[PDB]
Amino acid sequence: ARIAGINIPDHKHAVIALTSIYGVGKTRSKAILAAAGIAEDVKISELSEGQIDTLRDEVAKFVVEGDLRREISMSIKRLMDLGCYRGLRHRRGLPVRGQRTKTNARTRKGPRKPI
Amino acid sequence: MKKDIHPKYEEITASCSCGNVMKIRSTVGHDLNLDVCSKCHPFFTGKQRDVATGGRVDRFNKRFNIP
Amino acid sequence: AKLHDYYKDEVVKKLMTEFNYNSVMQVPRVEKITLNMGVGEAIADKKLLDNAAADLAAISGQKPLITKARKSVAGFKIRQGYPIGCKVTLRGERMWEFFERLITIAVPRIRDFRGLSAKSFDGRGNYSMGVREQIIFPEIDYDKVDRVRGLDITITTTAKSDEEGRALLAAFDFPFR
Amino acid sequence: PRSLKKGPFIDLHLLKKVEKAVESGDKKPLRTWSRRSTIFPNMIGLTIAVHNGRQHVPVFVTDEMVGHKLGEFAPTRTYRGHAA
Amino acid sequence: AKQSMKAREVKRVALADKYFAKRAELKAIISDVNASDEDRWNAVLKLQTLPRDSSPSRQRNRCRQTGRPHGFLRKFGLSRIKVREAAMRGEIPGLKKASW
RNA sequence: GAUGUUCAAA
RNA sequence: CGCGGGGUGGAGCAGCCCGGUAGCUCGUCGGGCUCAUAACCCGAAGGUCGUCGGUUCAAAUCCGGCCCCCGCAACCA
RNA sequence: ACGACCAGGGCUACACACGUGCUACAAUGGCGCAUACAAAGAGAAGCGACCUCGCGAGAGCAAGCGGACCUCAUAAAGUGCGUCGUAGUCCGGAUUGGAGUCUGCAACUCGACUCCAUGAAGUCGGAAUCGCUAGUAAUCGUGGAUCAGAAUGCCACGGUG
Numbered sequence A: 001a002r003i004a005g006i007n008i009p010d011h012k013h014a015v016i017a018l019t020s021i022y023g024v025g026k027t028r029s030k031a032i033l034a035a036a037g038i039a040e041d042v043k044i045s046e047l048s049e050g051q052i053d054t055l056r057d058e059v060a061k062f063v064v065e066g067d068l069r070r071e072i073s074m075s076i077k078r079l080m081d082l083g084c085y086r087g088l089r090h091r092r093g094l095p096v097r098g099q100r101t102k103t104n105a106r107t108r109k110g111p112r113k114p115i
Numbered sequence B: 001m002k003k004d005i006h007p008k009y010e011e012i013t014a015s016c017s018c019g020n021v022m023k024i025r026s027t028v029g030h031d032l033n034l035d036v037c038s039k040c041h042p043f044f045t046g047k048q049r050d051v052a053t054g055g056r057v058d059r060f061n062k063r064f065n066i067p
Numbered sequence C: 001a002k003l004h005d006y007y008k009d010e011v012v013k014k015l016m017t018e019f020n021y022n023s024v025m026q027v028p029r030v031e032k033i034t035l036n037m038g039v040g041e042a043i044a045d046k047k048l049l050d051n052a053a054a055d056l057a058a059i060s061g062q063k064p065l066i067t068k069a070r071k072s073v074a075g076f077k078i079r080q081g082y083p084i085g086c087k088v089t090l091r092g093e094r095m096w097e098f099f100e101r102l103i104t105i106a107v108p109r110i111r112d113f114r115g116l117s118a119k120s121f122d123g124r125g126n127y128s129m130g131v132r133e134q135i136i137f138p139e140i141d142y143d144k145v146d147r148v149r150g151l152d153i154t155i156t157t158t159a160k161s162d163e164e165g166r167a168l169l170a171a172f173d174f175p176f177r
Numbered sequence D: 001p002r003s004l005k006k007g008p009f010i011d012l013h014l015l016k017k018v019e020k021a022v023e024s025g026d027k028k029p030l031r032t033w034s035r036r037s038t039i040f041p042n043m044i045g046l047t048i049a050v051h052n053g054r055q056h057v058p059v060f061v062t063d064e065m066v067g068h069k070l071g072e073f074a075p076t077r078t079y080r081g082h083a084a
Numbered sequence E: 001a002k003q004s005m006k007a008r009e010v011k012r013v014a015l016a017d018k019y020f021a022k023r024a025e026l027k028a029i030i031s032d033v034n035a036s037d038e039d040r041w042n043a044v045l046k047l048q049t050l051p052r053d054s055s056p057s058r059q060r061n062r063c064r065q066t067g068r069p070h071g072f073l074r075k076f077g078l079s080r081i082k083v084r085e086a087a088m089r090g091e092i093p094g095l096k097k098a099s100w
Numbered sequence F: 001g002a003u004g005u006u007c008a009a010a
Numbered sequence G: 001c002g003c004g005g006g007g008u009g010g011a012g013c014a015g016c017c018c019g020g021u022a023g024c025u026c027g028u029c030g031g032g033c034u035c036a037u038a039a040c041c042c043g044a045a046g047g048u049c050g051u052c053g054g055u056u057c058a059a060a061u062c063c064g065g066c067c068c069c070c071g072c073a074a075c076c077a
Numbered sequence H: 001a002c003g004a005c006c007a008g009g010g011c012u013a014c015a016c017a018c019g020u021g022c023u024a025c026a027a028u029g030g031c032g033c034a035u036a037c038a039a040a041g042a043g044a045a046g047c048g049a050c051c052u053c054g055c056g057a058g059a060g061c062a063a064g065c066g067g068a069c070c071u072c073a074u075a076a077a078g079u080g081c082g083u084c085g086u087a088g089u090c091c092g093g094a095u096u097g098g099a100g101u102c103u104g105c106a107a108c109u110c111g112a113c114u115c116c117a118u119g120a121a122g123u124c125g126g127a128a129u130c131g132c133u134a135g136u137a138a139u140c141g142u143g144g145a146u147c148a149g150a151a152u153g154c155c156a157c158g159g160u161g
């Protein structure tokens, strides 16, 4: 299956396929299906790629895929040009929220590096 | 000028937030939109500083009202 | 040649009155505007000199010229005949196109501005200035370049005296201090 | 984050000195120890040297700066590297 | 340097008593109330002009007998070690060793 | 079942 | 000059013949065991093999060129 | 002046190792719905129902309670139902962007929580090493003190076993 987004959702439970789509969370998946009205408890028969036509227009109201990524990039480049502490952690690959660097900061710094 | 070696150079129209539009010959290849020009600059004998122009400054103002 | 047409229509008569010249030819003019970039990391990374050259090629339409070192120097660990700098000399309509672009866009785009030193002239009327960041020119897309280097702009002028040189650029409305 | 209802946070001495400079034109940097104060549109285009324990560090205010605290930009610790 | 910390704590409880009931409550409520507008801004201004030591949060709970910052228990107003010794001397009423 | 030195007086 | 041998992890040594993608020993660094140290144990990193070509699906491996070292024999402008 | 009064910072920095915890690596589980029980304790600069609005953290209004009465605050695995069907997964949650709540003079360094998005490592861990003999380990919830605010710790409590 395909959606308005560039990435293609898998053929399976409709809610799960949307969670996988970038930019759309499980809760946002439920938001647009509430507007679309397509539930999984309806007749499974008569299901086609034509049906997601309503999905194409309603998802477009939410920034997703490349649009969100562009937003993330502009937010981080601004941080770098600002000279703020928040930007500096981004540059050095260090925690950006105030978590301890002494220990338990592996996700930010990366694999262990010998002295 | 020697052919081939020199970058392509066509005319482009660069617009400004103040509304001034300048036709400039540059190698950008695209009509970029800029914010500050010579006319809207405090040093270039500007009467109205860029403070009047909006942006995320206006967004800060809508959230916090100090009238 | 936007700033050229202005010069021969208004600047010429403007300078003519305040100096009491005898001939139009006496009125100084801008001969050439050499743009110079220097890469001390060319010996370390020759690729960086090519990237700086690509930046100057974007800033000014004319293709950049690679300057080899004039003489070997011990302090800078350089050898004669080794590419080190990058220079473009603008003398025609493209000189005027760069000049009008610099005043209209590059000078405002500078982060913090307090005026351009009127004192910074070679003493022969030829104005030399230094650009701290290459990103100010809109030619290079911001965040599309490896590092933010700088350049040196020199306005060689017919004027034999600094006083004639300042008034020529001032007539163009150059942002002097 | 300060609550929206309470509005933005600013120090009296900081705001008073900013208004005293704006009316008399930009001329000198405002040396302040108030890192808690928020960056305001009124002080854009000015160099506020927010205090860093050892010595004040100069910051030039910009439009993107507004919505962030004065101290947030300022260095608060020096750690160049573990290696010499 | 314990005496200097105690000399400060006596100033903080004196100033808080001086100011907590005269202006602290009103400046907070007129800032908090949604209906109030503009004045809530001016109210914050006069608040910062105050000494700032009045704040009850400037006060730190400390034993009266030994002026100790940590180990303080409110009911006894004493530090943990002071409570233990007093309980054994029988000074604290109803306090016995606990078994269960 | 490897190796483990020393230590003024009151 | 002829013939034979050698160069592979910091070092040393295999693997070579009979091509199947390269190990060990010792050292290094980190951990463990012990009151502590050694021994020991575990994990990690390190060269794709003196170099350059050819061959081939594929080369430390096979055949040449070159460099250095060594053994023996040879040398009447 | 090894005294004292102040404002800002630091004790939360971080090539790195160790100690003790937490959360996992799923299907005896995750998700959604329906539905069942505690014991212990704390409260007047305090617990704060109900009601209205907010997806919500919350805000407003305001009953009652110095406490077998009021309020936290009612439990969780459990049971019954549907789906996942073994996949880095309807596992797992790091991390990060955006926005808001609350405390507090103020949350930038340096608070917690909510929402929207993101979905790292991890498919059970090397040499080695710890705790526990019965309601004990194991597991699952609850309360307290400290406390303006700030638990995964700590002192208690019950559930299954």
Ligand SMILES: [Mg+2]
Residues within 6 Å of the ligand: none
């Ligand atoms: Mg004493």
Ligand SMILES: [Mg+2]
Residues within 6 Å of the ligand: E057, E059, E060
């Ligand atoms: Mg306190």
Ligand SMILES: [Mg+2]
Residues within 6 Å of the ligand: none
């Ligand atoms: Mg202080």
Ligand SMILES: [Mg+2]
Residues within 6 Å of the ligand: none
């Ligand atoms: Mg500490």
Ligand SMILES: [Mg+2]
Residues within 6 Å of the ligand: H025, H124
């Ligand atoms: Mg598991």
Ligand SMILES: [Mg+2]
Residues within 6 Å of the ligand: H147
């Ligand atoms: Mg608390």
Ligand SMILES: [Zn+2]
Residues within 6 Å of the ligand: B016, B017, B018, B019, B020, B035, B036, B037, B038, B039, B040, B041
């Ligand atoms: Zn403009």
